[PDB]
Design a protein around this ligand. Sequence first.
Ligand SMILES: *[C@@H]1O[C@H](CO)[C@@H](O[C@@H]2O[C@H](CO)[C@@H](O[C@@H]3O[C@H](CO[C@@H]4O[C@H](CO)[C@@H](O)[C@H](O)[C@@H]4O)[C@@H](O)[C@H](O)[C@@H]3O)[C@H](O)[C@H]2NC(C)=O)[C@H](O)[C@H]1NC(C)=O
Ligand SMILES: *[C@@H]1O[C@H](CO)[C@@H](O[C@@H]2O[C@H](CO)[C@@H](O[C@@H]3O[C@H](CO[C@@H]4O[C@H](CO)[C@@H](O)[C@H](O)[C@@H]4O)[C@@H](O)[C@H](O)[C@@H]3O)[C@H](O)[C@H]2NC(C)=O)[C@H](O)[C@H]1NC(C)=O
Ligand code: HEM
Ligand code: HEM
Ligand code: IM8
Ligand code: IM8
Ligand SMILES: *[C@@H]1O[C@H](CO)[C@@H](O[C@@H]2O[C@H](CO)[C@@H](O)[C@H](O)[C@H]2NC(C)=O)[C@H](O)[C@H]1NC(C)=O
Ligand SMILES: *[C@@H]1O[C@H](CO)[C@@H](O[C@@H]2O[C@H](CO)[C@@H](O)[C@H](O)[C@H]2NC(C)=O)[C@H](O)[C@H]1NC(C)=O
Ligand SMILES: *[C@@H]1O[C@H](CO)[C@@H](O[C@H]2O[C@H](CO)[C@@H](O)[C@H](O)[C@H]2NC(C)=O)[C@H](O)[C@H]1NC(C)=O
Ligand SMILES: *[C@@H]1O[C@H](CO)[C@@H](O[C@H]2O[C@H](CO)[C@@H](O)[C@H](O)[C@H]2NC(C)=O)[C@H](O)[C@H]1NC(C)=O
Lengths: 553, 553
Amino acid sequence: PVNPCCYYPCQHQGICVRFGLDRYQCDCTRTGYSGPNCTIPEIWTWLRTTLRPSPSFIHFLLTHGRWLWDFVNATFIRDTLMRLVLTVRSNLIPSPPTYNIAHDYISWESFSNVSYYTRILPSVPRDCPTPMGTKGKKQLPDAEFLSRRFLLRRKFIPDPQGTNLMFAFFAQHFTHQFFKTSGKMGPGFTKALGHGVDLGHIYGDNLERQYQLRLFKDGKLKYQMLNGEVYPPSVEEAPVLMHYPRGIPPQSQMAVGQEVFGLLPGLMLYATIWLREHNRVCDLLKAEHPTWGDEQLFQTARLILIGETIKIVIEEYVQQLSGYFLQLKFDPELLFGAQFQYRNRIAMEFNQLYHWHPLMPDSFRVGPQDYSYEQFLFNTSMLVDYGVEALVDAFSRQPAGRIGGGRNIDHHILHVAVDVIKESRVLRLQPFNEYRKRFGMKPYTSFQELTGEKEMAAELEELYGDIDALEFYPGLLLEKCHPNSIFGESMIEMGAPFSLKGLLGNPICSPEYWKASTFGGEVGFNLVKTATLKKLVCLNTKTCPYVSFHVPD
Amino acid sequence: PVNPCCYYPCQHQGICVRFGLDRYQCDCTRTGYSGPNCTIPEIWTWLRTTLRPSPSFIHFLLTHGRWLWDFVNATFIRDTLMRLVLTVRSNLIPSPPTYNIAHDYISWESFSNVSYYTRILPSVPRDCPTPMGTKGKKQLPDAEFLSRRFLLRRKFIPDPQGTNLMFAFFAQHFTHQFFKTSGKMGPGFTKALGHGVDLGHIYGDNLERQYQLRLFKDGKLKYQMLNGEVYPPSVEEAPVLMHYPRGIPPQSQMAVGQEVFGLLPGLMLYATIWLREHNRVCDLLKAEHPTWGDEQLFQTARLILIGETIKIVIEEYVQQLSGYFLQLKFDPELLFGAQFQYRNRIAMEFNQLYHWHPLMPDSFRVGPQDYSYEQFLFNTSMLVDYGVEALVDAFSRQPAGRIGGGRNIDHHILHVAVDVIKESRVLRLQPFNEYRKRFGMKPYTSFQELTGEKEMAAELEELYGDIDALEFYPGLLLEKCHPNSIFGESMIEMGAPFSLKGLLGNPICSPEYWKASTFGGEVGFNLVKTATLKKLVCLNTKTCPYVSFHVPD
Ligand SMILES: *[C@@H]1O[C@H](CO)[C@@H](O[C@@H]2O[C@H](CO)[C@@H](O[C@@H]3O[C@H](CO[C@@H]4O[C@H](CO)[C@@H](O)[C@H](O)[C@@H]4O)[C@@H](O)[C@H](O)[C@@H]3O)[C@H](O)[C@H]2NC(C)=O)[C@H](O)[C@H]1NC(C)=O
Ligand SMILES: *[C@@H]1O[C@H](CO)[C@@H](O[C@@H]2O[C@H](CO)[C@@H](O[C@@H]3O[C@H](CO[C@@H]4O[C@H](CO)[C@@H](O)[C@H](O)[C@@H]4O)[C@@H](O)[C@H](O)[C@@H]3O)[C@H](O)[C@H]2NC(C)=O)[C@H](O)[C@H]1NC(C)=O
Ligand code: HEM
Ligand code: HEM
Ligand SMILES: CC[C@H](CO)NC(=O)Cc1c(C)n(C(=O)c2ccc(Cl)cc2)c2ccc(OC)cc12
Ligand SMILES: CC[C@H](CO)NC(=O)Cc1c(C)n(C(=O)c2ccc(Cl)cc2)c2ccc(OC)cc12
Ligand SMILES: *[C@@H]1O[C@H](CO)[C@@H](O[C@@H]2O[C@H](CO)[C@@H](O)[C@H](O)[C@H]2NC(C)=O)[C@H](O)[C@H]1NC(C)=O
Ligand SMILES: *[C@@H]1O[C@H](CO)[C@@H](O[C@@H]2O[C@H](CO)[C@@H](O)[C@H](O)[C@H]2NC(C)=O)[C@H](O)[C@H]1NC(C)=O
Ligand SMILES: *[C@@H]1O[C@H](CO)[C@@H](O[C@H]2O[C@H](CO)[C@@H](O)[C@H](O)[C@H]2NC(C)=O)[C@H](O)[C@H]1NC(C)=O
Ligand SMILES: *[C@@H]1O[C@H](CO)[C@@H](O[C@H]2O[C@H](CO)[C@@H](O)[C@H](O)[C@H]2NC(C)=O)[C@H](O)[C@H]1NC(C)=O
């Protein structure tokens, strides 16, 4: 008796539920639709539906009004739009969370067990005809083939927006504080409990490690003086676990808080900037509150970094990524009148689409030098040799590849990509088209309409057999991109709701926390309010290099 | 240099923060007041303040309109008042949480470490002249004396409202699912993570124990057949830890989920009712969703019990406790338009004031019998001997003592009471008067005005030396009560905001969860919507005894 929920009969977020042996019913509660499968729009939905422009249209308004936008940016409309930009986005993610790899229904376990990642759509019923539901071929395209064929880079296609490597790392670094799939527990589980921008990739994700990195005096953090420059302390003083390859655990083998940050110079680079920043924030506080202790000084600085991060990530990171003339803005008060839940829970579908491995270049220019991957990966002395300053400069000047369009994932890391496709099935994520719907979009009606061409589209149909069978990861990466867009429509529409629900879902964003006392004094607050990328670097360096999320000129 | 925050200079919830060595500043952000210590009311606060009636006045309106209330109860006003009753209450508790026994300021640790209990007011600065701040005697009244003198019962004063023992246990049982101070970690910490009405006192507070009690078939729970009646299974089948005294761990030594529930017949009684209920809910589901599995059937039943509990606790438990003619109501939709955070975190001040030990009688009448404490405590066969039916009857007919007024805590358990006073100081809870303020009330100006008399008032002044030095627990229990009130003004005003923030702060109360699909089908929902005390018992018994939260007649 085909599990009726294999067809995905419920629309607009209606919940499918089997009754009897072969029947089912949709819970169209608050879906704004009624009827058997939630397709009969209520009065306003109907209006909302007809008076609602396409996502692509809006993208165009946002990427064109050279003049119209300097005006709006200069007016209050800026806020109205931001506040609107928020609420609508965030409304698309359930909260409290809903499902996990264990349950495809609401459970007290899914709500309480932080270890699990959460999902937006239930998984594919584990008893459906096809691996994806009902349509498609009995077996999915060999992820090895599918990858080499379409995601493997041939000629490096750089990002039409000027996005650079100084950005690519910040991206990698930053995201790894909530992405930490527990190899031990397996996929769908996370060592990174906290789920937000708690910075458990600096101060570590367990209390000991914090105490291990923590230098218990004036709230600061441990560190070493190589060349007169400050860096993460080595394990020979910070007895904490890492993953440095079997070489020189003594010096050059630094402690950071994110075990894996030894592996690449970019991350250690950032970890250094932050570490050198935190200790810098501590200094300021100790001057303001001399009677303060170590615990405070520390905590107050941790909050000040959770702020500064959320600030930069929104007003600069997303600003550059967007290509918007509307100048994005970070001000928690914008949501104080709305109904918002200050609590985020990283989803697996988020994790999957944040696999921007194609941002990665061919080699790594660093002034006259030009290291290959072989010289760059695991290199444990590049950082301290060059000097943050000099390194920052080198990444802020080298283009980063385009994420979408297809075939742009370098050949080295191309395995990560086959893994995301392989694991994607382990998790049993519904077809691309189902995620299009669930996120307020129309399903593509052909591989033709999906891909901005006809060649790839042909091979695809031949593999998956039907558009409705396409996979989550492969789809996202093969979708046609708006010209001069770092990635396609779906990437923008699907991930923004996850990103903002996260950034603003942080407790420090709530009315309760957002006071000047939380960052001890007015000094803490202003730091969170005026944080910049340029300031994060040039404040913690000797010389002011060239830092930005886009190549100069 | 006296820690300036020892005087408690900040008003209306303004945050005190030391600057320099001997200075300080108040963060009157969103306190509705401005100025040095937050005493200059903004425009509306001033109005809100003048057009605001006293708590005692309102209590009178709520406990008098015999006619006016049958009307209001019969109209929509009922909802308007409930919805108003809620929001205003819940607004008084910070959310996300704020402090713990470790930090007297906002910290990412306090937000993330569930192990800690949270506090409303910061603790007493650990460096102030007096143990309570500035006023009072260098040392506090011997908690042994203070207890015997005022909290020790002389003549048993029953509850003017007809509250019975069938209530006293439900109260004890129910509260112990969020109150579990970790003896091991000490005071201010809790084994009961979850913090809400998660029922971790049935299904246990760890996954194993759940699996230990869990009979992995049709979602039900393990159990034994004594007399043909269903009871918790014994440890000789449910390998889970308990605290039964060194006697017969084999039979009569039952497994429940709350280790300590073996100690008294009342709790085991309730645990039985619930356990026999859950397995009862499972039956219904299995009929509706025959294709369902064990995990679901189980989880769906757990949610159905979290509902039914929140229902009864509000519409019956608090209804009886209140003495209100306004008929309280449980409907999550009442808050869907408001700004509410669906997340609760048990506070230590809540824990302290939920110590209703004086509810406990002198002996325990059970028909013709009349067990003393010595025969009642630890009795491991009273339950199965008598039969739930017969036992329920016996508690629903025996008056429960009055909680307030002073001197009504039986002599046996009088130690618990000295402990709460002893630990209260370990935690360093601010003086009674500070908690009066923080909860929108006027501090008492004399022991005279506090206590509904002059005798006790005299001895008190002589001990504490000043009203402003009185303690949290002793105050609450010695405060004058409105005639025919189970307890005083402060108990009502301070604890309601904690109780409701809790009950409604449950994720199942959120828009996201409150759908009929969450309780699988319409059957689950209606069960949560029509749950009663009478139904919880008489549905899971052979004969329908007399059950209620107040003595018959
Ligand atoms: C919520 O918070 C509580 C309380 O903070 C957590 O429990 C507590 O955790 C800490 C560390 O995990 C335990 O540490 C204690 O401290 C001594 C002192 O350490 C010594 O001095 C420094 C410290 O780094 C080092 O240089 C030395 O090498 C050495 O380590 C430590 O030695 C002991 O191990 C001792 O336990 C603390 O005791 C512990 N217990 C409590 C409850 O207070 C709790 O884990 C956390 N909850 C969660 C799950 O996150
Ligand atoms: C969030 O959820 C995860 C996943 O559920 C938790 O981790 C998992 O926890 C369970 C139990 O704690 C582990 O149990 C496994 O099951 C076997 C089978 O048990 C046997 O059969 C029954 C079961 O009760 C009994 O009659 C037998 O005596 C016997 O126990 C068990 O034997 C093994 O111990 C095995 O571990 C599961 O393996 C474990 N691992 C994961 C991640 O899947 C996780 O704790 C939870 N997070 C938190 C902190 O709450
Ligand atoms: C130097 C280039 C990079 C290399 C060599 C690299 C390598 C890897 C490897 C080996 C894995 C583990 C296996 C897997 O899950 O497939 C992984 C996971 C991941 N990478 Fe990268 N990566 C790189 C850059 C990036 C960047 C720039 C981002 C961010 C936009 C990124 C985001 C991720 C995420 C989100 C994961 C999954 C983490 C998890 O396990 O939950 N990576 N990467
Ligand atoms: C038969 C009568 C009772 C006895 C013998 C009893 C005994 C105890 C004992 C020995 C403790 C541990 C020591 C302490 O913390 O002081 C305790 C704690 C407590 N009791 Fe009772 N109690 C009884 C009834 C009740 C009732 C009716 C309630 C609820 C209104 C209640 C609520 C509590 C709470 C909230 C705690 C603190 C739990 C914690 O440790 O966090 N008790 N009781
Ligand atoms: C103006 C509303 C519109 C809604 O779609 N745009 C926005 O909300 C802005 C917006 C947000 C918030 N982005 C994200 O942070 C994001 C991060 C990671 C992933 Cl994987 C996906 C998205 C954008 C990424 C790209 C973009 O243009 C090309 C816009 C946005
Ligand atoms: C009508 C508003 C007014 C506000 O104070 N009353 C209410 O909100 C009703 C109200 C709530 C919610 N109670 C609690 O559950 C509660 C439970 C444990 C503790 Cl330790 C303290 C309070 C009452 C307890 C007693 C009472 O009269 C005597 C009213 C209430
Ligand atoms: C690790 O990085 C260092 C650079 O910091 C590499 O050494 C440099 O190699 C280039 C040529 O590849 C020389 O011209 C530089 O003078 C070297 N720097 C010095 C003095 O060490 C090193 O080869 C890298 N190791 C790996 C992993 O290949
Ligand atoms: C535990 O409770 C039982 C009742 O279930 C007590 O036994 C009863 O005691 C009374 C007099 O105290 C007798 O009249 C009943 O007939 C007894 N019931 C039977 C047949 O066992 C028992 O004494 C209690 N034990 C303790 C802890 O004192
Ligand atoms: C709701 O969705 C189901 C899913 O297919 C629709 O399908 C049923 O009815 C169709 C036309 O009558 C048939 O093509 C399907 O075989 C049949 N399948 C199922 C799941 O029963 C169903 O009609 C939809 N409801 C309506 C009336 O719109
Ligand atoms: C704010 O509260 C403080 C706490 O006492 C007030 O007290 C200061 O000033 C009083 C009168 O000038 C003195 O009696 C106190 O010694 C003094 N103590 C401190 C803490 O400095 C203070 O005046 C209040 N602010 C105002 C002006 O209302």
